[PDB]
Amino acid sequence: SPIFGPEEVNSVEGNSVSITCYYPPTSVNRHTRKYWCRQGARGGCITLISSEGYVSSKYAGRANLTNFPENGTFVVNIAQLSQDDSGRYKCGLGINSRGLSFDVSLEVSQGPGLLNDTKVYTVDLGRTVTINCPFKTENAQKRKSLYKQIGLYPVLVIDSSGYVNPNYTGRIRLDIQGTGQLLFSVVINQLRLSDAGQYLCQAGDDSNSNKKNADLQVLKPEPELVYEDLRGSVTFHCALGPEVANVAKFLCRQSSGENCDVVVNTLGKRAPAFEGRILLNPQDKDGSFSVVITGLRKEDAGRYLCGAHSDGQLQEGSPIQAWQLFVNEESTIPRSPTVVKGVAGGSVAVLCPYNRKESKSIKYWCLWEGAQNGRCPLLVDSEGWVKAQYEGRLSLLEEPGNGTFTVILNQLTSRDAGFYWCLTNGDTLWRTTVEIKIIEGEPNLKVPGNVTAVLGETLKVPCHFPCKFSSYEKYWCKWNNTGCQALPSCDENSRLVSLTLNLVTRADEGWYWCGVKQGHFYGETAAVYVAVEE
Amino acid sequence: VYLLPPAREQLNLRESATITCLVTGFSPADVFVQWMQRGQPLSPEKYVTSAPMPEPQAPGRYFAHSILTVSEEEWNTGETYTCVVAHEALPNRVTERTVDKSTGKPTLYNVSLVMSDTAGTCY
Amino acid sequence: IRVFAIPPSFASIFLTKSTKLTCLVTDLTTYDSVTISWTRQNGEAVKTHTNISESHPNATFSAVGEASICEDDWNSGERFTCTVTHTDLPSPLKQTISRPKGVALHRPDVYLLPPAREQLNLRESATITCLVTGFSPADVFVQWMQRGQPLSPEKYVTSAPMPEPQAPGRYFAHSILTVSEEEWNTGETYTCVVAHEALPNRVTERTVDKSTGKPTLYNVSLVMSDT
Amino acid sequence: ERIVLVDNKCKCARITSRIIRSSEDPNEDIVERNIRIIVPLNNRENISDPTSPLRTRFVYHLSDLCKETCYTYDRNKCYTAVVPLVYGTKMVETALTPDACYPD
Numbered sequence A: 001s002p003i004f005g006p007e008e009v010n011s012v013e014g015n016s017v018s019i020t021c022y023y024p025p026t027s028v029n030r031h032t033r034k035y036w037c038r039q040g041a042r043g044g045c046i047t048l049i050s051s052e053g054y055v056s057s058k059y060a061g062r063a064n065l066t067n068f069p070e071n072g073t074f075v076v077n078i079a080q081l082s083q084d085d086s087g088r089y090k091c092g093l094g095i096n097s098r099g100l101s102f103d104v105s106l107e108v109s110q111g112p113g114l115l116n117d118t119k120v121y122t123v124d125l126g127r128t129v130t131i132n133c134p135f136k137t138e139n140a141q142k143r144k145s146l147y148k149q150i151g152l153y154p155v156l157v158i159d160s161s162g163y164v165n166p167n168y169t170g171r172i173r174l175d176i177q178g179t180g181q182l183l184f185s186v187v188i189n190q191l192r193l194s195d196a197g198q199y200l201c202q203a204g205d206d207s208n209s210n211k212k213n214a215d216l217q218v219l220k221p222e223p224e225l226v227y228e229d230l231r232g233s234v235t236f237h238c239a240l241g242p243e244v245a246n247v248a249k250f251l252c253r254q255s256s257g258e259n260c261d262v263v264v265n266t267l268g269k270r271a272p273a274f275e276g277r278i279l280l281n282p283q284d285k286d287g288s289f290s291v292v293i294t295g296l297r298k299e300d301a302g303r304y305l306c307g308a309h310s311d312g313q314l315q316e317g318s319p320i321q322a323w324q325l326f327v328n329e330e331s332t333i334p335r336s337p338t339v340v341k342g343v344a345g346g347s348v349a350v351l352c353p354y355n356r357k358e359s360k361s362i363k364y365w366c367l368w369e370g371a372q373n374g375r376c377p378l379l380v381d382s383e384g385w386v387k388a389q390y391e392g393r394l395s396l397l398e399e400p401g402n403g404t405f406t407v408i409l410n411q412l413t414s415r416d417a418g419f420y421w422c423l424t425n426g427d428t429l430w431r432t433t434v435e436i437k438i439i440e441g442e443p444n445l446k447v448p449g450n451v452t453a454v455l456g457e458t459l460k461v462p463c464h465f466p467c468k469f470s471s472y473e474k475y476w477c478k479w480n481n482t483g484c485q486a487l488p489s490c491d492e493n494s495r496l497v498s499l500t501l502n503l504v505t506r507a508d509e510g511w512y513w514c515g516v517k518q519g520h521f522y523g524e525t526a527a528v529y530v531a532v533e534e
Numbered sequence B: 001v002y003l004l005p006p007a008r009e010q011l012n013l014r015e016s017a018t019i020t021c022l023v024t025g026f027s028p029a030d031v032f033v034q035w036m037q038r039g040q041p042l043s044p045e046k047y048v049t050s051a052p053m054p055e056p057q058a059p060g061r062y063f064a065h066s067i068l069t070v071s072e073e074e075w076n077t078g079e080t081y082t083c084v085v086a087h088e089a090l091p092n093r094v095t096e097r098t099v100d101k102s103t104g105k106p107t108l109y110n111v112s113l114v115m116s117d118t119a120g121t122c123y
Numbered sequence C: 001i002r003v004f005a006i007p008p009s010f011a012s013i014f015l016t017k018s019t020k021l022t023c024l025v026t027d028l029t030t031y032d033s034v035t036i037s038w039t040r041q042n043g044e045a046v047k048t049h050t051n052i053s054e055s056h057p058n059a060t061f062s063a064v065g066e067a068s069i070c071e072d073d074w075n076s077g078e079r080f081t082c083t084v085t086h087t088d089l090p091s092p093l094k095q096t097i098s099r100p101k102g103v104a105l106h107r108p109d110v111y112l113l114p115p116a117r118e119q120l121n122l123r124e125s126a127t128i129t130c131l132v133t134g135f136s137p138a139d140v141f142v143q144w145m146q147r148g149q150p151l152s153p154e155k156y157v158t159s160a161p162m163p164e165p166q167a168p169g170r171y172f173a174h175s176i177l178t179v180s181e182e183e184w185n186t187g188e189t190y191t192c193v194v195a196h197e198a199l200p201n202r203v204t205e206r207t208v209d210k211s212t213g214k215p216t217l218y219n220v221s222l223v224m225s226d227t
Numbered sequence D: 001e002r003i004v005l006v007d008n009k010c011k012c013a014r015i016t017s018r019i020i021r022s023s024e025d026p027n028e029d030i031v032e033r034n035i036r037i038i039v040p041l042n043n044r045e046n047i048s049d050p051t052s053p054l055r056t057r058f059v060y061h062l063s064d065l066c067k068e069t070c071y072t073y074d075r076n077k078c079y080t081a082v083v084p085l086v087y088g089t090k091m092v093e094t095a096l097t098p099d100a101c102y103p104d
């Protein structure tokens, strides 16, 4: 189950092929057997190539197997295929007898052709293609038309008089070029799976009838395998062309009965299960763009499609792009709390994890925005930049420092509720998301309100705390881009840690915080702004 | 604390899905109990709470009860209806336990021992 | 006058961190004033060599050339030269040794076959075949170990590397041990250990007794309580 | 769809469960407790001292492990027994299983 690879791969004889299978990057899977085996109706994998060196006697020179522990991958290259290789296979690790493995299907077919009267034509679905067909010199004013031989009979797709197949109507044009050129072309729009077949040219009604038999293949996209862990994040790169820039975009996910369910639209539509944890970047010069999904769940694995349509949904004959997704479930992403509850006027504290190796990056923090094509601007970083609207009540900090840091946000309000993302400058990119709910009550900390003061004296401001904060150390700090630093020797029994300012200048202007420590973790704080008068 | 499921014959009238949470042999009284359903406390009237009447055979210990009903049609989603006890004499002062349909007792086993030298591994 | 240049085993290093390198000349003439000098590839000489050999009893005369280096130097792989300068042929012969470069790492796969039941019917002696396989580079080291006491090597004999028929690069080796059948009939398991520089902590090992190896008898007695 | 009640990777036990939501009759369903064990019949009783007898009994008080002497080498966390080597004696480490004791 924790192994991942491509389900079915097709090629034709004489060609090479290269298969990639994925494993979690743990120590053993970076340092133990990988294999490619073949089963049958006889009960057992027969090993064909191994990571330990052994190659089957029938596969000497044919194939080899390589492991990239850094990618968490091992690769299988097969060349010189034949029709005797089509069957059921499995990638896997460790002892063949167990199933730390993944099943693969393989179908090999002969290289067709031999027909000089018909060439190959493989194109993409929903795209445009055109067929060029010659006529002899006597084909001046003579019927120019194509015919699709479907089973028993040939039917017509475009005439020389304006008729067109109602299955195909409006997607087609006939061109006979001037300059004494003796060919013609047929252009088709909205390429569909219901279009693949064998055509036939014609040049006129007469006995001449310069026919040209033709094929029509349509290239569905080969799926791409994506490997992400549980409670992790993923970035998809959709790569449509500039030819659908005006047209909207979409993203669906495959389901049972050939039915995408949409997850987000250029029309602002969005799946309710994926509310919050989805982003969408603006489109590029080529219309290229990317979709960021965070906090993936066990049912989120599967095939994904991104496209471009007027309705921003699935239809027959529209350009698409595919992905195949896998969720690990043998994950290393630490389970962090997802929902964090606060009260109006209260505080919140959020623990944000990241990969331990890139601890010297620049943490960021962004707010998700709906009612849009989805947006998420920054709010704070680790150098100390902060959004201009939140001076005083917000700071982040690297106290735990082992891939985990803490964020403290006090003076909570019910208007602030929503979803928050955590970012990093590292190449690996977790985007852990936490939701803030607001409930009823008053915060545990008690501090007087916003107060003015005279210049140049001694002033004291109190902060009592409840009995549940009685087992900690208590402190005051001065808020700034640097955050907190406590002021040692302001205390009582389990209440009333009080700030005292011996002498004061207006350089001490600003917000101050009163808070408690959890040994090496942080807790509730509260804030008060102080002015200076004279 | 235990959490007994309804009776099988209860589950043939096809309306009343009784559920029983409980508490046994403890000192002292004043204990508080409540039922939690997916991190969401139930309706306080939905259940009914006992009072800590004393033990029969124990020297002086206490015990109480609480019962709750739901649609037996609901006893197909289940969601294990976690009953949150709240007693002072607990390491974190809460000893939650919960029970659902899938919990309890099955009457269809299928043990499946295997046997091999290819072991000592536990994949 | 024939000289063996003896590079220390990776095992000798890793169990000593003392990478002495030596060269022996065998069945020469032991005059006195026998002189051999260790030099690097640069020509520059290195530390000297003491406790040198003397005249053999059976005229197969010898002289040990001791030396030392830093381990990383050998890892760096530069040629090392002890040269014989004795009046027998005052022409300076050249013994140049190095470390090969480009050899990949590959692990021993130590199976351990138990004595054939047939040999148990000649009724005296039993033989066990510790095996190593499919590994690179050459020069595995092995010894045998049982009941927490080491087995002095005159009990066991070991092969040397020689390429696999199938693996283009990987060598293998053996080891053989001879023991009284009653001793193997006693139970009295045996453990063969291997040390080799593709092995994680450098040392793996396996064991076998009468019961593990090819038993005719499988006696499971498993109890499964409280389903 | 099953619900792994227990998965003890050092006994190779795995009690799952699955309600067999029946033919769409009323609630005459029976829940179902699959079990599975892969007993080795190769290892020691002191799993981490290959100088002991093999094993005969395999006792599964499922009560105990529905929650430390358990007898399969767990794949991921690896073992060792310091072992003497002689080149003079030296009392030195080992790696009783490979491909998991790799300090990497």
Ligand SMILES: *[C@@H]1O[C@H](CO)[C@@H](O[C@@H]2O[C@H](CO)[C@@H](O)[C@H](O)[C@H]2NC(C)=O)[C@H](O)[C@H]1NC(C)=O
Residues within 6 Å of the ligand: D046, D047, D048, D049, D080, D081
């Ligand atoms: C029998 O097993 C026990 C525990 O399963 C072993 O006890 C300790 O094992 C560690 C393993 O690293 C050693 O470092 C300790 O020295 C062992 N303690 C003792 C008192 O032996 C024990 O080693 C096993 N039996 C033997 C003979 O090793």
